[PDB]
Amino acid sequence: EYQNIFTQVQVAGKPELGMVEGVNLENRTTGTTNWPILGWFGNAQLGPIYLGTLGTMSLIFGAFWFFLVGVSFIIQADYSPALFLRELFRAGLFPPAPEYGLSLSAPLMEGGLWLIASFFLMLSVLLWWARTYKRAADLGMGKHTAWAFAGALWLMFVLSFFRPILMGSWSEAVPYGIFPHLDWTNNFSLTHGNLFYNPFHGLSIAFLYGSTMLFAMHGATILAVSRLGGERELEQIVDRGTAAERAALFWRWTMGFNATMEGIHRWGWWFAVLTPVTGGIGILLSGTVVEDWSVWAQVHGYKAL
């Protein structure tokens, strides 16, 4: 039986340039390419993109942050292109040391460049957030994507903005290296007792696992009912066919309750969004409220002794 995992025969007509629903067309590029290796899995069209004020500004600020991280790597390699490549994952642009507190007076190669890059990184993610909002607004769509992105941004900002301010030191923000930010994560768990005994870290993991499991379930369900017009999820929300019914009856017979075509996406939205929302809460409480989650768990009756 055909498993709808890969397309068998690809087809292509005139390239699709998008819906016009209040988008400024002069900010939308005009060139599309049609790349058939992608058409085995999904769409083949590498479509146009929209480039307006917010996107341009976000790209400029983010690219400058990226550039500044790179330049710091070059300088700490003592200019060597060999060390630069050998340490592309092991090097990091680190925040100022604890003695500088939250002041903006730390040497340029000991946190100052970290501060400047961090400022421009902050600017670009917020501008990208505004972009996600405004692209929905220009098409007349709801704002669910921007809200979901706000949750992930909330974890990001508690990581490097909110919590270091509440702790009184930039030195607790995460550095900009591939391996050093993993080292940062490990150190963070090690200094706050053990982050497994942080209930919001537990809840964040539950929502991460659940969102992975949920989208295994949902992708498998839609693929299983693809024989019927299944993946046309919109228009099954407003005109229920057998794909939606059989999808509902599978899960009802299996676990005793089911979702609807529209409502499974609310479950997934909330499970995905709750992972960084709950995670940010648990990091924010670490150090500020609880210093040692292990003894806190012992006091609150979920760690023995």
Partner: protein, 275 residues
């Protein structure tokens, strides 16, 4: 109590083992042959968990833990209070998980639809079986399985992680984390896009699937498409499961030092070895 469209789908057929012997529903739940076996396995495992809890000193459901046998029993069957209850529950868990998948197969056969759901759940089952069977068999002791408890199995995760230094430096672990993070991001974006199209700005007609192609093409330049997003989410989650299982399988069987030292192949490449 049937859904208002359910009746026309409640027909005989689709079973694998026992014909019409178990081909009936109990409330919402289809039973079938593997519903009988999954109920029995689940009940016996739960009930042995409760019995093992009774032999301890706490009834707190966050402190109850059933522990695997000590290493000195190797791969033998342990005395029932010295790890044997763990083995009974583990065998019951495998029985129930496998029965659950086979029951899912029968439901798919009755509602003639693809078998993707039991396949994906089998990937989850494989991760579990790697954790409690495959890895401890290669290491030669059931006691390398993880203790059963809401917060004590996290002690297992901690101890095994810190056996190999910082477990972050495990390339398969890195790959698995990226797949978990990415599938969560993809679920967020897919749910958001569907909800945005179905729930427009106030007073506007419902959006089309063209509008959502247009939304991602405007935002990132690419749209995978309606069929593509489900294929993508399915394979992302399945790969996360599989590469996590490979991550843990490699640790203690073929790799034994701190995982950080694995990257010494790159850091000790002879041209920049000494720099």
């Amino acid at each position: 109590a049937l859904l208002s469209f359910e009746r026309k789908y409640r027909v005989p057929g689709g079973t694998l083992i026992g014909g019409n012997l178990f081909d009936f529903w109990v409330g919402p739940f289809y039973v079938g042959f593997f519903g009988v076996t999954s109920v029995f396995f689940a009940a016996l495992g739960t009930l042995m968990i409760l019995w093992g809890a009774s032999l301890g000193d706490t009834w707190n459901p966050l402190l109850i833990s059933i522990n695997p046998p000590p290493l000195e029993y190797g791969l033998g069957a342990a005395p029932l209070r010295e790890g044997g209850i763990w083995q009974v529950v583990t065998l019951c868990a495998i029985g129930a998980f496998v029965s659950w998948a086979m029951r899912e197969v029968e439901i798919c056969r009755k509602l003639g639809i693809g078998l993707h759901i039991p396949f994906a759940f089998s990937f989850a089952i494989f991760a579990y079986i790697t954790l409690v069977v495959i890895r401890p068999a290669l290491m030669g002791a059931w006691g390398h399985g993880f203790q059963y408890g809401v917060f004590t199995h996290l002690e297992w995760v901690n101890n095994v992680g810190y056996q190999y230094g910082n477990f972050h430096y495990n390339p398969l672990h890195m790959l698995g984390i990226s797949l978990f993070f990415t599938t969560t991001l993809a679920l967020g974006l897919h749910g958001a896009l569907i909800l945005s199209a179905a729930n427009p700005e106030t007073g506007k007609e419902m959006r089309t699937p063209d509008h959502e192609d247009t939304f991602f093409r405007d935002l990132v330049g690419y749209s995978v498409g309606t069929l593509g997003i489900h294929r993508l989410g399915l394979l992302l989650a399945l790969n996360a499961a599989f590469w996590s299982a490979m991550c843990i399988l490699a640790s203690g069987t073929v790799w034994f030092d701190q995982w950080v030292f694995w990257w010494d192949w790159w850091y000790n490449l002879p041209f920049w070895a000494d720099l």
